[PDB]
Amino acid sequence: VTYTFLGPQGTFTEAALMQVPGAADATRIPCTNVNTALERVRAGEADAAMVPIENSVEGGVTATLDAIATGQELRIIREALVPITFVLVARPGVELSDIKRISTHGHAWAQCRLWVDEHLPNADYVPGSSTAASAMGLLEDDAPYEAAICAPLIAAEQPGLNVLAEDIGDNPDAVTRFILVSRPGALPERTGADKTTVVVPLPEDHPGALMEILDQFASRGVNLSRIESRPTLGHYFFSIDADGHATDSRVADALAGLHRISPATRFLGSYARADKQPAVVAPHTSDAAFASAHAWVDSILKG
Amino acid sequence: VTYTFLGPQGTFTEAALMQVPGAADATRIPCTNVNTALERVRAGEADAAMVPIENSVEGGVTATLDAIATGQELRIIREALVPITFVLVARPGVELSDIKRISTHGHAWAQCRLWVDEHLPNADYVPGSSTAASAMGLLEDDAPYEAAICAPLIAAEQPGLNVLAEDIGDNPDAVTRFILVSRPGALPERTGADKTTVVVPLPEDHPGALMEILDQFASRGVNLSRIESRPTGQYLGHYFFSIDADGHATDSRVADALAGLHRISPATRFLGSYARADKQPAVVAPHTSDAAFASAHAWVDSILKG
Amino acid sequence: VTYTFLGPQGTFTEAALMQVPGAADATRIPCTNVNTALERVRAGEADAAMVPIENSVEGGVTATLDAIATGQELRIIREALVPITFVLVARPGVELSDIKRISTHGHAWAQCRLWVDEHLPNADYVPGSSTAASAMGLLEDDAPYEAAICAPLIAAEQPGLNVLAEDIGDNPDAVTRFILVSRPGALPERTGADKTTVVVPLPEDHPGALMEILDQFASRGVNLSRIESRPTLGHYFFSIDADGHATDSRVADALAGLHRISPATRFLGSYARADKQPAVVAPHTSDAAFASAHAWVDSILKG
Amino acid sequence: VTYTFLGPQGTFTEAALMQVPGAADATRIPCTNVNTALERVRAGEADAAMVPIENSVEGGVTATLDAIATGQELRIIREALVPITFVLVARPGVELSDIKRISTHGHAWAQCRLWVDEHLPNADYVPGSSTAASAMGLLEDDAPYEAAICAPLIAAEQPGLNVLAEDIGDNPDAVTRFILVSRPGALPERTGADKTTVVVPLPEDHPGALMEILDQFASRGVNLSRIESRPTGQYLGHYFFSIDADGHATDSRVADALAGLHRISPATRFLGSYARADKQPAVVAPHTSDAAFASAHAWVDSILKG
Numbered sequence A, C: 001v002t003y004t005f006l007g008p009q010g011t012f013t014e015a016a017l018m019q020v021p022g023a024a025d026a027t028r029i030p031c032t033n034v035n036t037a038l039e040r041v042r043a044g045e046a047d048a049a050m051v052p053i054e055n056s057v058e059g060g061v062t063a064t065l066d067a068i069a070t071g072q073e074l075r076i077i078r079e080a081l082v083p084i085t086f087v088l089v090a091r092p093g094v095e096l097s098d099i100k101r102i103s104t105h106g107h108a109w110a111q112c113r114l115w116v117d118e119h120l121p122n123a124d125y126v127p128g129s130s131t132a133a134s135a136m137g138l139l140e141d142d143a144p145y146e147a148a149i150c151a152p153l154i155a156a157e158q159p160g161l162n163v164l165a166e167d168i169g170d171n172p173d174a175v176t177r178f179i180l181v182s183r184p185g186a187l188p189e190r191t192g193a194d195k196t197t198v199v200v201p202l203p204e205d206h207p208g209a210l211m212e213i214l215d216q217f218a219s220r221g222v223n224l225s226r227i228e229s230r231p232t233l234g235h236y237f238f239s240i241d242a243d244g245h246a247t248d249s250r251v252a253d254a255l256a257g258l259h260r261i262s263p264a265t266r267f268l269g270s271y272a273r274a275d276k277q278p279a280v281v282a283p284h285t286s287d288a289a290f291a292s293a294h295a296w297v298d299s300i301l302k303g
Numbered sequence B, D: 001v002t003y004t005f006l007g008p009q010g011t012f013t014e015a016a017l018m019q020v021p022g023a024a025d026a027t028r029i030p031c032t033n034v035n036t037a038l039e040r041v042r043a044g045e046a047d048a049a050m051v052p053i054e055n056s057v058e059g060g061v062t063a064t065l066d067a068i069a070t071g072q073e074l075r076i077i078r079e080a081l082v083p084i085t086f087v088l089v090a091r092p093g094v095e096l097s098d099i100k101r102i103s104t105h106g107h108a109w110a111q112c113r114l115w116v117d118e119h120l121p122n123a124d125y126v127p128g129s130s131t132a133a134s135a136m137g138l139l140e141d142d143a144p145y146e147a148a149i150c151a152p153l154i155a156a157e158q159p160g161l162n163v164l165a166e167d168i169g170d171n172p173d174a175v176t177r178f179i180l181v182s183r184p185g186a187l188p189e190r191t192g193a194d195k196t197t198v199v200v201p202l203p204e205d206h207p208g209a210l211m212e213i214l215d216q217f218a219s220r221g222v223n224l225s226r227i228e229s230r231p232t233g234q235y236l237g238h239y240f241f242s243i244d245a246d247g248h249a250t251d252s253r254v255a256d257a258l259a260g261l262h263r264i265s266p267a268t269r270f271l272g273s274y275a276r277a278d279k280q281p282a283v284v285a286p287h288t289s290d291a292a293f294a295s296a297h298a299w300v301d302s303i304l305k306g
Ligand SMILES: N[C@@H](Cc1ccccc1)C(=O)O
Pocket: A222, A223, A224, A225, A226, A227, D202, D205, D206, D207, D208, D209, D210, D211, D229, D239
């Protein structure tokens, strides 16, 4: 079992990957970008890729959204919501008062403003490429900064890095959502708290065209948790997360409705919700209701 | 083979039954009212009942809509659209100048205004129970009127009735819609020019509730030709909707819509699929053909099974 | 103040009219049919016409529905829900056991079946034109029946008619709904439990065309209590009763929406509900919500 | 006149600001991030901020979507669609054979694969914070790489930077969408080819909730060109929707839609009406013209007042 991820080593993305069951003791390959992590999977060199999909402090989200929606034959098999905790690290013997410059990824920098502005008002920012690269950069004697903002992972992995501050994020409950992406296989088992992702191409652009797509879910009691339009036909695709599993009668039926409107629709997997909240199923929308209605129609058709 | 129909004999209703193939030589039983007509079918004592459902010269329409919405299951197997022609009728020897009083059903009267005002301006309307009864009343001694407005049928059948004026109605396009109703059996063969009728009880009364029911048809490209709400104490939404859709129950979009209806309202009644009197084919919208439905099912199957 | 009604005198329709405030002591003109009652009003000879619209035991409903929907310049100014109580009447000295034949309107006959089948199983039916005409027919010595089913009004008006049975209807709570129709004037005052009627022509016949019409009400929290399609353009009109008064912001706005789709839409009046049940107004649909939203748009437009 | 933009200098973002009329001779302040850019505008210290909103070679897009959805009111006054052209850059004397390491923003790297794999198959990517920083890093002693991928802008401005390869991107149609954002003032004049942007907080999370919001546009013939949901803890539905519609706030169908949105969600933010970069006029659907709206208002008025 081999996983790729958005590298380098010790980023928030790897930290997320290591909480996946068995991944702490699996082979984890850092890739320089989402496409390469994804190519490895597509080429059979890796079983799955761990990539950010919401609120990454390393960047990478838009590239993930591009990749799953313009790609071919990929399935999301797992998601993860990982609390972000920022630490400030420096080389041993460097005190808080010695810090004149701090390197990190721009996303992390923006999220730690209150702490830094209060506790290090004389510290100026040095743009980094990732939090991990900013941290590893300290290990060079000539580094052009004195501290970095990074994940607790990197701080505990590196004996040459000392934590000077912990939990310095503006929001203590901030989270990144990640997805684990593999080649198509069997559908993960339904848990009752599941999510389904599709990418729906727009056949014709006119008012109410999205409405028509959205209705396939809504008329069937299927809640949505994410929607994004992307210019690419009607010149758009819609990337959509829905509550439920392809196995649920209401969801299977919504998928059929989607295909009829847009037969190039892509299925991106059904998988367990990281939040473990089961869909509240309206009774007229239940598996039993679908079976009862189909049985009633059959009795007419065969009467 | 036994038919019932809304009586008495000689009404526009009978005339309509008379047009159904084989009926002229079949047993035709006139019944007092629509319920009595249907009752006989439900009880196993008649094969089908011919009842009006729109623009009845004799009344009976609301009775029909309520009767088919409750009780033993029934199916519409045929519809008829019968052109309405009115004749003015009287005993032999009676001329236009001799008419002071005219009896007919109020529905007939209201449609013969133009001719009557023009040619019998001094004549008074005497309300009748049906066109046929009005006509038959003339064969009695000292009938309290001198003319009747009725169907050509009853004039042709009664020797004592003379036609004083032909085709006296206000509306050239006037037609009555009838339905022939039986106990449930097989669906007839689809034709591509079919109608499907359902009665949908409202489960819960709120804005957009009907829209939710109508969307089952609209979202699957199913055109409607009739909707009517009716109060009722049987449903906890307090209404039912009587609906005619374009299509046959076996058409994939229609079967699918029917399933959607049952999910919202499990007490939905299926009232049959049957050929359109006017023979006009359903227009099948994009994405809603049997083929599109089958492609979509196969796609979902590949996901489930792959 | 002069009213017409669906005659003759002593029908359930007149009984309904006499419960209208001041009508018991107004001039009430019986008309042989709905059109004539309506012509009188249209010609200025009568102020209003009382005609049945739901569950008439005298007939007349479909003619009412035809008239208000194909007519010109008429407004419904009042509705009434009148409990139906049937009485069986005969000439003095005629006993229950003397009744061989009963005349009434077909609608009344169908609604009294249980009583008659139990209490008079030997009585056969004689079709009548109205319950009142059936009753008045007894006053002739040569009448071809012995009893009639009619309104309590006719029974109490006519000293020559004796009640032999009362409340013989299958349903003790059965009701007829009637409407009072006048020429256009000022809108009746809003009560908070109001109804509005329109007739909407269908511009084009296609799936979802009615949906579009219905949405104008639904998207604005406006409940409907009656809908009927009629073949007559799209070849239909829709006769519609909605909850609310034209004065309510959500209703005025629904009316505007209707006009845009179908500019030949006819307004048939706003008037008090006979059931006196106030609409439950969703907060985002309230007059205050409409005023707040319009004020917010104005601040943008004028900023 | 003072602009801020997502820095540093020489990025694709600056190049885009540079295209706005009068900007080449205006004060242009580079800012660390999107929030800092907007902050300056909000504080009264800059007139407008130029920030990316789609397909940014430099990042910044999610920052933009979140920043304009909360806090002090802002308005988009202009949008720009800027074609992306990549150059390969190095110090003088350095040739293709001399390159083992290339630095750029990951977004640039991912779009230059074809050319790089073909012509520099042995070169390794060194991730940079921005294209500009990658380029500027080459002017330093013993930079840990030998080439950068950046905008033509920074190559033209830096003497120490030599263009080794021109136009090396994978996608001919690649463009970045930017927005120029100011404090609220007057609506600009409508053109018939306008865009309107709003941010709509979800009040309550249930199936069809978004549909209810989208229907405000769809039921009034208003076409959409962008929708994005974003999580947030501020709304009790837990999301907001970022939306671009075809039209100008003064168009009757748009003002009407805006009112519908406010009724559902009173905390709706108005983000401006502004000319479309591509100059494509709104198509005005049947029944939705200013004239139709005015006829309908006048009809309702006749009822109210008559
Ligand atoms: N869950 C709601 C709102 C929503 C839509 C899309 C994305 C996020 C939330 C719906 O299905 O309509």
